[PDB]
Design a protein around this nucleic acid. Structure first.
Ligand SMILES: Nc1ncnc2c1ncn2[C@@H]1O[C@H](COP(=O)(O)OP(=O)(O)OP(=O)(O)O)[C@@H](O)[C@H]1O
Ligand SMILES: Nc1ncnc2c1ncn2[C@@H]1O[C@H](COP(=O)(O)OP(=O)(O)OP(=O)(O)O)[C@@H](O)[C@H]1O
Ligand SMILES: Nc1ncnc2c1ncn2[C@@H]1O[C@H](COP(=O)(O)OP(=O)(O)OP(=O)(O)O)[C@@H](O)[C@H]1O
Ligand SMILES: Nc1ncnc2c1ncn2[C@@H]1O[C@H](COP(=O)(O)OP(=O)(O)OP(=O)(O)O)[C@@H](O)[C@H]1O
Ligand SMILES: Nc1ncnc2c1ncn2[C@@H]1O[C@H](COP(=O)(O)OP(=O)(O)OP(=O)(O)O)[C@@H](O)[C@H]1O
Ligand SMILES: [Mg+2]
Ligand SMILES: [Mg+2]
Ligand SMILES: [Mg+2]
Ligand SMILES: [Mg+2]
Ligand SMILES: [Mg+2]
Lengths: 343, 343, 343, 343, 343
DNA sequence: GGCCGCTACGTATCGTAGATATATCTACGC
DNA sequence: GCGTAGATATATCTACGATACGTAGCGGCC
């Protein structure tokens, strides 16, 4: 069958909810972005940053998880022979309790996340304030200053040598007090990547575009991947969105499969084409239906757990500005050639 | 009988006042908002915020308490088997005697309230400046920097994993020094809610609307629940107001039940439809009557403890703007569809 | 006799002056406002603020003292059975040297005043900086940060459970530099009151009309009590003024009682209703007479130590303004009817 | 053959990728810059700085590696006879987390990098906080103040006496707080160089022109080497770029040698004449074409890993203004003569 | 002969380069300044500061070295009889990493530099924190507060009694943040000179003029020696420069003596008449010629190792700026006579 | 005359060294 | 024979200085 297993109807609601939660769909944009990211990670070729832009609800975190899993699987056969190697390390950036992104916490959290291997790996981190304990947890005291933590993290990264160092919610790097400090933050990250040779991938919303082009050096060593949404203007994206809706409705564990392609306009209006928004909206509707033990879904039910027009209107304002800034037109190439004198 | 028990008359005045205080009425808006909130808490589906708005004397705190008690009673069977579980952690915000919102105090208050289980549960939380004592209290020294407290709170929340984290009178988060810092405050809370995977519910008045829609990501990860007041224009709200007035009249521990529905216009004038304000009014009047040991109530007694016109006028000014902001019309849908191209 | 005992004549002038000073006459406004406040603080019913409004001489301080003494008397039988309870505590706001009202000093003075019971009650207050001493005083180290003092004061307030917290001269809270600071001062007070569940009565002059109505929450959770002065328009007010004046005349410890009711116009001119102004004016005149032992009082004696016109009109400007804002007319009532739709 | 070894086609993908990566092409600009740098390092003649300006892709780091290798080779036969001497020490500047550059970390890391000889070499540097360990690595305590580290580093430099002291990514020196502090930073570097008599070479992007001629004293002891890119206005640079493209396509390990000189305009458009960027582009394209096992490179393949137009547009912006500062014209000579009176 | 020794042509390049670098030419300005400095050093007569101003290239360091060597040779006969007497002690000024000149480092460096005789002198300095070691190099337990180290330096200076204390690049004293702190620095140096009674000679660039006559006390107690460069308006210095060029071309270890007299304008343009800069230029050109084994110096060779016009323009920009400050005219005499009334 | 932007200053905070409490080894006086 | 004294190293507390941020008062513009 092309849908959910029919056996799940007999099971209680918890397994149905879980099955729908763990189910993931493949859509053209996700596949394309995944391929590009994997190709970039495999041969960075002197690139230290991968800025993965995308709206909220597009699949950035799911993409990161998929890439992480595939990298781990790929590195497993070699990990059998060679040890002290982590295939990929991922951390999520923290919004600071202030207007400035503290770096000490970032360093210590990176050290914690990177260093949770089998205890057999001993590498005697530099600086004396960082050590192991009785429970295998990294001990970092307030004794150590930020440069010391940075040195320890650099040595650890060089020793472990992960393929890529994922940083999720990278927009939080933009919490600075000074405008030039915005470039300075990325310069610090660039130096960290340069002196360890570990590829850094930044995943964030369209407010990460403040980091897009700043200093030529950073522009040279950054790869821009755009996780674009499904627009309504292009008929192909509409067809793709409808296919996603069709497979979602096929995969909804209900006694009766509802008709979702019919109200595709409503889904687009309340999701803006983001597959994640559609997925979690359908998750809410399905949870409600399972709680009510209702064989199927109604538009009303969709209207209950939809997103407010005000919510979506703010979404499209940011998405509109994000895509406008990331727009490459043939006219732009003309100025570049004209400026370069190649006209 | 559908009213107060008759045997209370023989018992003294204090227990009568206590009975009226402990008495709670059920009205359509309360039950609707309660069911919506319970459904949202049962599954967030990638949401980290619930912004429950509403006027004053509307039952937000009572709704919170009801939700907490319901969730606790739901979780008790599983608590009997699995230890180290707190179903709901509910906290109220603190208005800084100054300007900025003290995050350190928020974190330490969270640690204090969250960790009051049976002493058997020990988790030697990260950072060495937080520990138990000889009375079971949590000791937080001033030496512990705010990010350390954040890490400790994150660990505790991750282990205990409450279903929902209530932040009452959340409008106190607006006490900030920088205008843009509103979004920063909300981002800090979002980041705290991301890595812990704990649903944050922000209980607040209409002043909380300043946080209502800032950035797309916060829009995606928030649901807006509106505790609307019983308006006067819609006849059904008038019927509900009269019904709750009659219900209150029936459960007034007096020798003679006063006729209360007749003067409903006065009650609406002073309570603006908020059930809480009406309950306060009737509590004051009952206390006065029981002090005078009078058989029944009169409009006079009502006017003594009535809210004055001036203070009541300010409330409606706040309510009028709040409801206007939170009003979604069919027209607003049209611009959203027009902008997207779904016309 | 209804007047001073005749035995005071033999006693020296100091004793007579003391007898007249500690004497406190009762007037209809005094008893009315006293009963209203008693009934308001007998149960607050979700009101956290009491705003006793009154000009110079209404008798706010003496009303506070009367209320404290009454409740202290009322609580003796329970105190004999239950320890660790203070019936009522109260302080006076400090006008800060600097621009901003100092919350640290307020908190520390509140802690000092509240915590002076018999030394048996030990409650091991939070914060290491707070404890007892060799002399039984509470020592507060300057190293203690403000939020820590607030938490300690909160715990003390919760444990001691006072019936009402008096803040005399509350107009001193208005010393702020930001327009919104005016409000979040009162918000901090409200948060302190809510978190402790202790009614906070604010006795202050007509300058407190600044704090009258700010936001719906503080508009709802506050009840306004107006200590109106005896005006001249109302014949009942004039009769009460003359009765109080006659009682004052009868209660002068003088060899021969002078006729005081004749110059009622002069007295009202120089006191404009404030009973306290009349009382301390008469204290002044009686002391002056006793210095010379003059068997009586004359018009020039009153004129010698009256209130000058320059100041006297100044109170009128303030008083008529406050009475203007505190005036609720039928026009305002019908304005609420129209706006709310109950016309 | 003038092309790549034809045996590589039998080898797997990794070998071919490694061969292409390890290929270093010789082009006129690199040759001339290398010769000038060798000449200026052979004898400083009262110079302490070599400023090597180069855009992001000129081959600054590969030039540093080449000169390092050559210096080591030239020092080798006397190194067999003379010990306690390192030919060259190579370091890279660290972008600080804070606003200002951290000199303590610079000093300690300089000591770390310079001090990795065989364990036999014992000097016993000044200050008690610096020593060896059981693994032979220098351990630096956190308690050592910056001047002490500076003194120890000076002693180490005067003992080892390296020919040159490479500070890569020297752009990070410009992160300071005070405007004038640039001069102080460069003077600190000059002072470090002077006592040790060690020629420092600073490699950085066109941003490093902020340090160019900020002081006459610093202007005297600095040599400006410009690592110019290939222009398009000059036919000679165009022909050189064409020749280098021919050499690259000649040595690409593919079954069919692709034709690249046709779209020289395209290659210039996305590389601005930078050689490193072109090499990285071709490395990524080769990796892609070698994953699909394709016997050639297709245009669309170049379009896949080409830098964004926005990235290249800005790189020209900083290059164009950078070259403008570095432009020497006959007009400047005439103004010098007029100012000097030599006209 | 008036040229270089002829037998060096048979010798390898290294010997010729060494001969050229070790050869020192004598020119009128150097001789005049040298004799003035020697006369001043012979007797200070109440002057505690010898301010030697000169551009970067005038030959300040070589003049200092020659003066120190001459004083050492003069004091050899007395040193043979009298021990514990250093004739001349000279240290270098350290540019500080922070914005403040570190006086502690200056004091300890002065002590370590001055205290390097054979181990027989056991002076037993004041303060317990400073002592010898096995290797003879003293160690200063950082603990030692800076003023105690200063006092130890005072004792060392009065015991050893050097003739002059040389400080190179004394403009490094000017790195402060407070405007009036310049006077404080100079006052500290003057005090250190006073009780020690040791003439302090400061040599630095034209930016040393910031402490020229910053106060009357320092103005009187300091005499200034100007190390003027060679100008162009005056034919005398032009002829001197011509003679210097002729001597250098006669002393070049080459087979053919190049004609440097033709391009005297070019040499003056690219050296600004600084003998040191010209010497370094010729050193570079000679090294290149020896590398190419060319029996001559071709013009283009001079352009290869010349200085950028931007560098030279910055040279002359600061040279002319300081010269007008250091210009004394007869016009400045008349007002001084007029102001005193001496006119 | 009113409102907005700048900036000068207080102040919390954090780095930082170095005073010090103390543990441990060894010698010696009781 | 043994306990205690003396010396010393070491981390950790603590005092002090540097710094970035809030912020109110004051100058400028409509
Ligand atoms: N292709 C997909 N298939 C199924 N679920 C998906 C897919 N893409 C996203 N999701 C759902 O989206 C949620 C994960 O968040 P997602 O990565 O979509 O958010 P995002 O907006 O891109 O990033 P952020 O967390 O920064 O807002 C999960 O509920 C996940 O199931
Ligand atoms: N449905 C109800 N039935 C009975 N009493 C109610 C009800 N709703 C509110 N109350 C009364 O209101 C008081 C609790 O405050 P309430 O929850 O109304 O405040 P709120 O306005 O929603 O919140 P806030 O304090 O933020 O303004 C109690 O006295 C409670 O008895
Ligand atoms: N009813 C009264 N009988 C006798 N004396 C009175 C009475 N009311 C006030 N007083 C006198 O007034 C003085 C106390 O000041 P009072 O409380 O009247 O001032 P107020 O202006 O109302 O308030 P505040 O203390 O804020 O200025 C005392 O001397 C007291 O004796
Ligand atoms: N002549 C060359 N031959 C081969 N590879 C080269 C050459 N020049 C540069 N590269 C390549 O360039 C990369 C090294 O970086 P490169 O020195 O070009 O950077 P840069 O821009 O000068 O400096 P930065 O690292 O500061 O941006 C390597 O991938 C190297 O293979
Ligand atoms: N008269 C001279 N004869 C030979 N060499 C000289 C002469 N004057 C200066 N030099 C050369 O100049 C260099 C010494 O530096 P010099 O004192 O000239 O520099 P400065 O700019 O005056 O001072 P600084 O750089 O220390 O501020 C040496 O290479 C030395 O050989
Ligand atoms: Mg996501
Ligand atoms: Mg409430
Ligand atoms: Mg009073
Ligand atoms: Mg490079
Ligand atoms: Mg010199």
């Amino acid at each position: 069958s092309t849908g959910f297993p029919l056996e799940l109807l007999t099971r209680p609601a918890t397994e149905r909810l879980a099955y729908f939660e763990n189910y993931t769909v493949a859509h053209p944009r996700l596949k394309e972005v995944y391929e590009i990211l994997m190709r970039t990670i495999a041969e960075p070729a002197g690139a230290s940053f991968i800025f993965v832009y995308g709206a909220s609800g597009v699949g950035k975190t799911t993409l990161r998880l998929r890439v992480e899993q595939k990298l781990t699987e790929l590195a497993l056969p070699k990990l059998e022979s060679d040890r002290a190697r982590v295939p990929v390390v991922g951390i999520e950036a923290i919004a600071p309790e202030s207007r400035y992104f503290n770096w000490k916490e970032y360093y210590t959290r990176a050290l914690i996340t990177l260093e949770e291997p089998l205890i057999d790996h001993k590498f005697d981190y530099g600086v004396r304030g960082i050590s192991r304990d009785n429970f295998g947890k990294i001990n970092v005291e307030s004794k150590v200053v930020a440069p010391a933590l940075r040195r320890a993290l650099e040595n650890a990264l060089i020793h472990r040598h992960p393929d890529v160092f994922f940083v999720d919610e990278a927009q939080h790097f933009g919490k600075v007090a000074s405008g030039y400090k915005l470039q300075d933050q990325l310069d610090c990250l660039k130096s960290l990547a340069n002196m360890t040779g570990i590829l850094h991938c930044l995943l964030g919303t369209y407010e990460l575009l403040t980091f897009r082009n700043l200093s030529g050096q950073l522009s040279r060593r950054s790869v821009d991947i755009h996780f674009r949404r499904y627009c309504a203007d292009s008929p192909e994206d509409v067809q793709a969105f409808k296919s996603v809706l069709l497979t979602f409705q096929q995969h909804l564990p209900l006694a009766e499969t509802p008709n979702l392609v019919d109200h595709w306009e409503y889904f687009y209006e309340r999701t803006l084409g983001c597959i994640g928004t559609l997925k979690d909206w359908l998750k809410r509707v399905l949870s409600d239906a399972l709680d009510r033990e209702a064989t199927t879904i109604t538009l009303k039910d969709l209207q209950k757990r939809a997103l407010s027009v005000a919510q979506c209107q703010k979404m499209f304002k940011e998405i509109q500005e994000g895509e406008r800034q990331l727009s490459e037109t043939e006219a732009d190439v003309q100025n570049l050639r004209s400026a370069l004198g190649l006209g």
